[PDB]
Amino acid sequence: IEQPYRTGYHFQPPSNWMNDPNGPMLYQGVYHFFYQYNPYAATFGDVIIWGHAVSYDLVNWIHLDPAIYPTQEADSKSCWSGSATILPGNIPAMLYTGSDSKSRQVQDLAWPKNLSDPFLREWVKHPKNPLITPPEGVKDDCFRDPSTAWLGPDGVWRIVVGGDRDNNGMAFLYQSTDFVNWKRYDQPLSSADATGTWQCPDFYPVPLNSTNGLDTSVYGGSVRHVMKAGFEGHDWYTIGTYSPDRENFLPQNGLSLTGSTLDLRYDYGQFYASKSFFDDAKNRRVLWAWVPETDSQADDIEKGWAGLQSFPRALWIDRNGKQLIQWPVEEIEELRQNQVNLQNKNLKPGSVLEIHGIAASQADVTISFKLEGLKEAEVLDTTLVDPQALCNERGASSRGALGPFGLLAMASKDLKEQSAIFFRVFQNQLGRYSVLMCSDLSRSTVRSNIDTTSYGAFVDIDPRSEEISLRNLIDHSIIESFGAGGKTCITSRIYPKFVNNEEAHLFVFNNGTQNVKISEMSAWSMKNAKFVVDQS
Numbered sequence: 001i002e003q004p005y006r007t008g009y010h011f012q013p014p015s016n017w018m019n020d021p022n023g024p025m026l027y028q029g030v031y032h033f034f035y036q037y038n039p040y041a042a043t044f045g046d047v048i049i050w051g052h053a054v055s056y057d058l059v060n061w062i063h064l065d066p067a068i069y070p071t072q073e074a075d076s077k078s079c080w081s082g083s084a085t086i087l088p089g090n091i092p093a094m095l096y097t098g099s100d101s102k103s104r105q106v107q108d109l110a111w112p113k114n115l116s117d118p119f120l121r122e123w124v125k126h127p128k129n130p131l132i133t134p135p136e137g138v139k140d141d142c143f144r145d146p147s148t149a150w151l152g153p154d155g156v157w158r159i160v161v162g163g164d165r166d167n168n169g170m171a172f173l174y175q176s177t178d179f180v181n182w183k184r185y186d187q188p189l190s191s192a193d194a195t196g197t198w199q200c201p202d203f204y205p206v207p208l209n210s211t212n213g214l215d216t217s218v219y220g221g222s223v224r225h226v227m228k229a230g231f232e233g234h235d236w237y238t239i240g241t242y243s244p245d246r247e248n249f250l251p252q253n254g255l256s257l258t259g260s261t262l263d264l265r266y267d268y269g270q271f272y273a274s275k276s277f278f279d280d281a282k283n284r285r286v287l288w289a290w291v292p293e294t295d296s297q298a299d300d301i302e303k304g305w306a307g308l309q310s311f312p313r314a315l316w317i318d319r320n321g322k323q324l325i326q327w328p329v330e331e332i333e334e335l336r337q338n339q340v341n342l343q344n345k346n347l348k349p350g351s352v353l354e355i356h357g358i359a360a361s362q363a364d365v366t367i368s369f370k371l372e373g374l375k376e377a378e379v380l381d382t383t384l385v386d387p388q389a390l391c392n393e394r395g396a397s398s399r400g401a402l403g404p405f406g407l408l409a410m411a412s413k414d415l416k417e418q419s420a421i422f423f424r425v426f427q428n429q430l431g432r433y434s435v436l437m438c439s440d441l442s443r444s445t446v447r448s449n450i451d452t453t454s455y456g457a458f459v460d461i462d463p464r465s466e467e468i469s470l471r472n473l474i475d476h477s478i479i480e481s482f483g484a485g486g487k488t489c490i491t492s493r494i495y496p497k498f499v500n501n502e503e504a505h506l507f508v509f510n511n512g513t514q515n516v517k518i519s520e521m522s523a524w525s526m527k528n529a530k531f532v533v534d535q536s
């Protein structure tokens with residue numbers, strides 16, 4: 001079993017290092033994907049260029065040669081993350097952070113040189129680069145990742161650039177009318193104290209009471225804005241109201257981002273540098289995210305590659321407008337082969353049921369539980385509790401009233417190694433229920449020097465009138481868990497040892513003391529994605 005950790009349907013370069021997804025966009029019918037890439041190793045390098053790939057369905061990709069790589073003094077040292085904006089006149093403009101001769105972080109411009117090439121292979125840079133340089137009180141290593149631009153109703157472009165002032169992270173706002181001459185706006189679009197540099201900021205609108213996407217330049221009352229930023233190792237976000245005129249963003253929760261258990265995240269596991277883009281062809285917003293390796297660097301060099309991209313997911317605001325919902329883009333269903341189905345099956349306490357006839361290491365699993373005896377739910381007020389802490393304290397082996405009940409993905413025939421994605425149900429002294437979702441990567445592998453931290457998050461649903469549901473995209477070294485239709489997502493990287501010889505298995509289990517009935521569960525074996533390489 002050669003290369004037992006490569007994904008079968010997730011995006012990743014033929015080899016080497018890949019990180020931050022770059023300038024995602026849908027242009028002239030072709031889905032363009034770009035990514036931070038090191039052409040020389042399975043490790044970050046001094047020379048990072050923009051990898052390129054195209055697709056007609058976000059599932060099968062054609063690898064192309066790099067698009068943006070050092071060719072100016074404005075980016076002589078490296079080409080880092082950025083975003084693609086399609087200006088009126090239908091011309092994709094790429095704004096990105098370059099590392100110039102004097103190792104400063106500057107904002108550069110670039111656009112397709114051959115606009116009649118469906119794959120937009122060759123890219124040309126503006127002579128005036130860098131179009132923006134670190135403002136007054138900003139360090140030269142704390143100003144990067146320009147976002148996709150949005151055109152104000154006053155016909156003026158706007159973009160946010162990550163950074164910070166006195167370690168206080170922020171989204172610096174800039175304006176322009178020609179997309180070349182940018183003027184910095186006195187205050188940032190959003191801030192947070194002592195969070196360190198803000199990375200890959202993303203700012204976009206979301207239609208209320210709708211599951212569709214909106215182009216970046218939509219404003220209204222039936223629209224809310226999302227200020228996303230990456231800091232302290234995760235991607236945080238906050239839904240609020242944006243006034244392009246007054247030029248201020250007011251978070252709904254009335255709270256500035258913290259990076260505390262009070263703020264929201266897209267995913268709660270391995271998920272970084274996330275960036276969305278609008279798919280006008282299907283009127284939806286697609287979210288791309290880098291999923292870092294969790295094994296050793298030695299391991300990376302060994303297997304010859306590092307970095308994966310979460311499967312593209314659709315994004316929209318929840319019906320209650322308090323949080324965002326994500327779901328794998330529908331095209332993924334095209335990879336489904338045969339199906340195994342379970343219905344009205346009861347998981348008695350201490351059980352472990354094996355799903356048969358599935359490509360256990362490359363599958364799409366959906367399960368929905370019907371709870372029995374909520375009354376017996378353990379009493380725990382989760383007001384200030386940290387779910388990741390809790391999932392790490394109580395793994396799959398920690399039996400409870402209701403829970404742990406869920407799945408055992410990428411597991412050994414003998415369960416020596418297993419990744420448990422499960423739920424727990426609690427109740428406070430007031431009889432109110434809380435649902436916890438876990439990814440117990442603790443026993444995921446017996447190998448050493450592998451990060452086996454477990455991830456966790458509470459799921460916002462009333463188990464007293466909703467079946468707790470879970471969907472897992474299992475693809476060798478990555479498992480993406482979607483709890484309750486997209487309200488709680490957890491991406492995990494697992495490197496079990498058995499994969500090197502024996503095959504993987506899939507189990508449903510209940511290690512609680514209460515019964516849980518599988519109202520229904522459906523699993524499909526996922527066929528490989530097509531990745532043709534057109535380079536040289």
Ligand SMILES: *[C@@H]1O[C@H](CO)[C@@H](O[C@@H]2O[C@H](CO)[C@@H](O[C@@H]3O[C@H](CO)[C@@H](O)[C@H](O[C@@H]4O[C@H](CO)[C@@H](O)[C@H](O)[C@@H]4O)[C@@H]3O)[C@H](O)[C@H]2NC(C)=O)[C@H](O)[C@H]1NC(C)=O
Nearest residue numbers: 065066067112113114115116117118119120121122123124
């Ligand atoms: C869209 O993008 C570009 C236009 O803006 C264009 O890219 C160029 O394509 C040409 C042809 O493929 C490249 O020319 C090369 O020239 C070297 C010179 O040594 C050769 O390796 C080879 O040309 C050969 O050499 C002789 C003279 O050309 C001749 O004896 C041979 O028969 C042969 O022509 C290459 O073709 C050029 O470097 C490219 N520049 C870049 C990097 O942009 C795209 O083709 C164009 N594609 C479309 C229409 O979408």
Ligand SMILES: OC[C@H]1O[C@@](CO)(OC[C@@]2(O[C@H]3O[C@H](CO)[C@@H](O)[C@H](O)[C@H]3O)O[C@H](CO)[C@@H](O)[C@@H]2O)[C@@H](O)[C@@H]1O
Nearest residue numbers: 019020036044048080081097141142144145199200273
């Ligand atoms: O690839 C560039 C892209 O990645 C981001 C994070 O999403 O950070 C870039 C950054 O850190 C990287 O490089 C260091 C080694 O210099 C490595 O340890 C780290 O894990 C990497 O993420 O690179 C510059 C320095 O060159 C730092 O300011 C930054 O932390 C993102 O900001 C950027 O667009």
Ligand SMILES: *[C@@H]1O[C@H](CO)[C@@H](O[C@H]2O[C@H](CO)[C@@H](O)[C@H](O)[C@H]2NC(C)=O)[C@H](O)[C@H]1NC(C)=O
Nearest residue numbers: 350395396397398399415418420443509510511
């Ligand atoms: C279900 O819960 C039991 C209770 O502990 C688990 O039992 C295991 O506990 C340890 C694993 O963390 C090991 O000592 C053994 O695997 C086993 N030992 C005990 C206490 O009986 C059990 O593994 C759990 N089921 C699974 C595999 O998730």
